Scaffold this active site. Structure first.
Site, PDB file in Angstrom:
ATOM      1  N   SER D  49     -42.187  26.315  33.133  1.00  0.00           N
ATOM      2  CA  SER D  49     -43.094  25.308  32.992  1.00  0.00           C
ATOM      3  C   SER D  49     -42.571  24.358  31.872  1.00  0.00           C
ATOM      4  O   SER D  49     -42.335  23.129  32.061  1.00  0.00           O
ATOM      5  CB  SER D  49     -44.421  25.701  32.702  1.00  0.00           C
ATOM      6  OG  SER D  49     -45.271  24.791  32.216  1.00  0.00           O
ATOM      7  N   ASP D 179     -46.921  24.636  39.938  1.00  0.00           N
ATOM      8  CA  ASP D 179     -46.093  25.097  38.766  1.00  0.00           C
ATOM      9  C   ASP D 179     -45.536  26.359  39.024  1.00  0.00           C
ATOM     10  O   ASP D 179     -46.173  27.322  39.843  1.00  0.00           O
ATOM     11  CB  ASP D 179     -46.998  25.197  37.439  1.00  0.00           C
ATOM     12  CG  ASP D 179     -48.039  26.233  37.561  1.00  0.00           C
ATOM     13  OD1 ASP D 179     -49.135  25.815  38.277  1.00  0.00           O
ATOM     14  OD2 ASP D 179     -48.118  27.140  36.894  1.00  0.00           O
TER      15      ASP D 179
END
Ligand SMILES: Nc1ncnc2c1ncn2[C@@H]1O[C@@H]2COP(=O)(O)O[C@H]3[C@@H](O)[C@H](n4ccc(=O)[nH]c4=O)O[C@@H]3COP(=O)(O)O[C@H]2[C@H]1O
Ligand SMILES: Nc1ncnc2c1ncn2[C@@H]1O[C@@H]2COP(=O)(O)O[C@H]3[C@@H](O)[C@H](n4ccc(=O)[nH]c4=O)O[C@@H]3COP(=O)(O)O[C@H]2[C@H]1O
Ligand SMILES: Nc1ncnc2c1ncn2[C@@H]1O[C@@H]2COP(=O)(O)O[C@H]3[C@@H](O)[C@H](n4ccc(=O)[nH]c4=O)O[C@@H]3COP(=O)(O)O[C@H]2[C@H]1O
Ligand SMILES: Nc1ncnc2c1ncn2[C@@H]1O[C@@H]2COP(=O)(O)O[C@H]3[C@@H](O)[C@H](n4ccc(=O)[nH]c4=O)O[C@@H]3COP(=O)(O)O[C@H]2[C@H]1O
Lengths: 304, 303, 303, 297
Positions: D49, D179
């Site tokens: 991320s 994500d």
């Protein structure tokens, strides 16, 4: 009391008898079979090695594999079969068909047979054919946990194959292992079991093609006596029974086969799941005997 | 232009049987995409025989002519949204006839590069009609054999895709002059797998253990008086299942590989007559991953 | 008895890893019933290791004790359709506690006849807790190894069978007197296949060519019928669908067979709350036919 | 330093929210004892991320000096948006600033980004070398033919806060991603699966410097029936790496803090507090200095 005292020696040649499904048109099958045993002079189970009736075979095959003679089969048929088709319903027809299987087949199972037998039915939930058998040598897969006739009596195994959806309610079956299977008529998947029986005598009990004698016996073709998508239903069934006789013709050519079914054209025939006139059905029995005489030369070669 | 590797002659005879779907033919294109990429050569250089039903015939005919999978996908993503968008039975069959006029106009069953077989049952004899390519693929009546009944591929393939409830019965005039009437090729055999093995053993002198069957289906997806329609949908299913249950009984010792997965999520409720390019594109992705699960097995079949 | 087949000991290690999905364990019984009949002997005489999960815990332990599949089904059909009838999540726990007392009255993890292992997740540390059976199956801290953590085999099963939103949280007291909080074992790993290969490579160090893992699932069924509820169910799928995707990359040279089929018709719609005895019956035979399609390849691993 | 020594040093970076200043301070102390940029003493870089942003920038160019510059200007702005849709537009604006038109073709080292699909529900891993995948070779386009500006934006899409980025692969199929934290918030295990099964490296040839962000305190039953499953996957995957790869020399740099004044809420748009995380993390390198220089030489 037996009038047939002919003994045929053992041989290495199998003889299959594949009966078709016609409903109340079984009189054509009884007519041709009544003269087949007369040429032999012995009970049919002493000469044939496999019978594979479908819905009507379910009846005549189960009776032949027990050791009955066509005279006895014809007597029970004329007495009870015209009574079944007399009710115009779906539950009332299944109630009457329930007693017929109970009176003729009291408590016998698939271990009280004297030859190789097989009855065709259809699973309603998974859409696959359910083929009852009598011996473990006829199975192709899952040799373990094999129970002859699924532990079910002849009374339910035959009646399940006779539940013609449009005319009869569905039939539930409780196997010996507690499995609750629901079945319908066995015609929807295969109305001419010649392709199955040849596959049964070729994979199981491996025999050569030149050592099999298949004899198919139909019910004859008859002229029919608001098309809300019902025409297709009639068409897809005919396309189904067709292209199978075409399929076995391409796959199995070197296997000697004889089919006994004649087409009628004059407007003097009717349907099957609604015919109950004794005089109307009596004419079909004679037509079957005439069809035997035209082919008695070849049948004598196979059955000897 | 990029696929250049070549394979020598081999005794094993493969076979490609394509299931008959509909607007869901993208799944088949997704599967065949990596298969040709894995081989590195056009499909007509490795396979020796191809059979297809309605959807599969569109792909079977184009493969037999030399079209690559990317070219078929181009012709598929361009015209399909039109024929599936009309709201009349006579409208779908009209536009479908123009499509065949543009892809191949002066082509009959003589310019193909490999053995082809296209299925279609009739409307009067209720028996299949299999347009073959060579005289050796026949069984009987090998005295009057025109390669493809003299009919062009334009109206031959259109006959297979003629689903009577939503299309019109295609009328064909052969070379001899017999006016034959046909309907959707999926009414007798929605899967030509059994036919392909039949046409390769009793017709072509090839024993078992030397046949590799690759049945590339389309996958099973959920669905988004009524007494006759329920029975009609079920009877078409019995003939679909009884045919495969009969195949593994006879030809059990024939190495086969069936590539068709199943999905149960309600977001994928694809049915017949689909034109939305969104759902039709997701199905093409599903066909790409199905090859990944069976790549280690296919490499022995195709080498 | 009627199971009197004796197989010789060989270096090949056969592993059987069971899944868990709730009351849908009948699919596992249907498949295992055919595997026992094919062998002709109880399952603990051919396998060297067996794991379990939320449901596996119930079948993996009974197999290690010496029971037969015909006897397990003789229990799973008289109490399982009963425990799911309770309304509150607490009554569902008061009932499950009595069952282990009546089947595993006094047995511990010392009277097993094979390598057992049950998966459960700690609530505070949030890591797996694997109840091993022997000190050879440990990967460190072997000085204080106590088989089964000194806990009876009746209490090590109520933990894995305790889903938090549907049951209560089961707290245990081990041999060293540690009140450990545990919940269902399907949160860290619902398919212990990756754990089993992990337990047969670093512990009991075998090669990759000497392991035959046989995975058994519970099938896939559609739903019979907020924002955080959606994400809750979504993240659980990402966990299990990525775990088997990981073992496929790591362990590829290890022969594996998964027996699980996907169902899409609106009639085979179930969850982990089914208590209809007739509806449970059809799931049983659904797995038996799934064995017939794979009987030719299972006989290659286990004779 | 030297070119090749037959050692496969990987660098798995964790990530979450604005807390990425920690790994910036840890990485700032590195590249100083060496004297060469990070893309020269490393053979693989993974990030989910926040490390994904750091993964690209190291793999295609500028060093930590410029990364902190780009991080201290724009980051305090995109977090200052109350609506969920505005954060996606501003994040897309930041992408086209530094990632103007570059793709996965001009990357100088092995890179891998993590993002899980929304339909198939399994990770989608962007790679940049021909020998980086384990199967389905052929039809292999580096980075799926997608620009780095959109590949990184997808890997940073927290669905409850951001919007699900829709990517159109060069093949033509639109993929809906989220994500890479919902599947694996720690690419350490994935780096071993790609470095051993694909690159075919021995079990004593690789060094794994996993850099985290550290654990900090916090400022209806489904809310807290959701954060728990997200961390069970993080801990269960960590323990599984110790079981399978116990003989792999690893160095994890991630310290815990219990001070109440260190409580972060994953979206702190504060320059004074995000600097303390940059400070606390420059000393975490000092506690392992005598050990790291045996790995990095
Ligand atoms: N000659 C044929 N022609 C066309 N199809 C055929 C034929 N034979 C079988 N099939 C189909 O193939 C499927 C699997 O057959 P299998 O022989 O491999 O396994 C059999 C056997 O092991 C055992 N069993 C069979 C009969 C019995 O009286 N007791 C008993 O125990 O049960 C399985 C039967 O189940 P179904 O009958 O429901 O399904 C069959 C049928 O659909
Ligand atoms: N694998 C199979 N499995 C199950 N059934 C099959 C299979 N293959 C064919 N059939 C059926 O068998 C019936 C008779 O086929 P034949 O091969 O014996 O003779 C052929 C041939 O000589 C000639 N001919 C064929 C093709 C061509 O392009 N030009 C051409 O001239 O005409 C006859 C075609 O008639 P249909 O096609 O209408 O009917 C077929 C089909 O329904
Ligand atoms: N195949 C695998 N794949 C991935 N992870 C695995 C696998 N196997 C185990 N683990 C995890 O590794 C962790 C550490 O295990 P350790 O072996 O290092 O030490 C054990 C043992 O010495 C002792 N003990 C174990 C079992 C018993 O019945 N009595 C008993 O006393 O307690 C310690 C705690 O065991 P847990 O099992 O609770 O935790 C395990 C598990 O979470
Ligand atoms: N270390 C790992 N740990 C756990 N799972 C892993 C790991 N590595 C891969 N996977 C999973 O394996 C699945 C299939 O991977 P494949 O190697 O078989 O083929 C690849 C490749 O050929 C091609 N491709 C790859 C990168 C690129 O930039 N362009 C491009 O075109 O596409 C496929 C990518 O698909 P996904 O990425 O969506 O799914 C992956 C992933 O979920």
């Amino acid at each position: 009391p037996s009038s047939l005292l002919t003994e045929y020696g053992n041989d290495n040649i199998c003889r299959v008898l594949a009966l078709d499904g016609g409903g109340a048109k079984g009189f054509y099958t009884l007519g041709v079979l009544k003269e087949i045993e007369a040429m032999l002079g012995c009970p049919l189970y002493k000469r044939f090695d496999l019978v594979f009736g479908t819905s009507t075979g379910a009846i005549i095959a189960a009776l032949i594999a027990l050791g009955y003679e066509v005279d006895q089969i014809h007597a029970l048929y004329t007495e009870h079969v015209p009574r079944v088709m007399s009710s115009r319903s779906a539950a009332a027809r299944t109630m009457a068909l329930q007693d017929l299987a109970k009176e003729v087949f009291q408590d016998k199972t698939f271990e009280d047979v004297l030859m190789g037998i097989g009855i065709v039915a259809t699973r309603w939930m998974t859409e696959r054919p359910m083929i009852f058998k009598g011996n473990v040598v006829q199975a192709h897969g899952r040799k373990g946990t094999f129970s002859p006739g699924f532990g079910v009596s002849i009374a339910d195994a035959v009646q399940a194959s006779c539940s013609a959806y449009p005319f009869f309610e569905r039939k539930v079956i409780v196997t010996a292992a507690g499995d609750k299977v629901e079945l319908i008529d066995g015609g929807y998947c295969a109305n001419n079991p010649t392709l199955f029986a040849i596959a049964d005598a070729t994979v199981a009990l491996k025999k050569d093609h030149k050592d099999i004698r298949v004899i198919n016996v139909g019910v004859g073709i008859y002229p029919e006596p608001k098309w809300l998508a019902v025409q297709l239903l009639q068409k897809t069934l005919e396309i189904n029974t067709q292209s199978m006789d075409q399929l076995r013709d391409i796959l199995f050519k070197d296997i000697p086969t004889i089919r006994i079914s004649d087409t009628f054209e004059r407007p003097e025939m009717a349907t099957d799941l609604l015919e109950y006139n004794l005089d109307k059905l009596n004419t079909l029995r004679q037509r079957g005997r005439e069809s035997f005489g035209a082919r008695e030369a070849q049948l004598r070669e196979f059955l000897i």
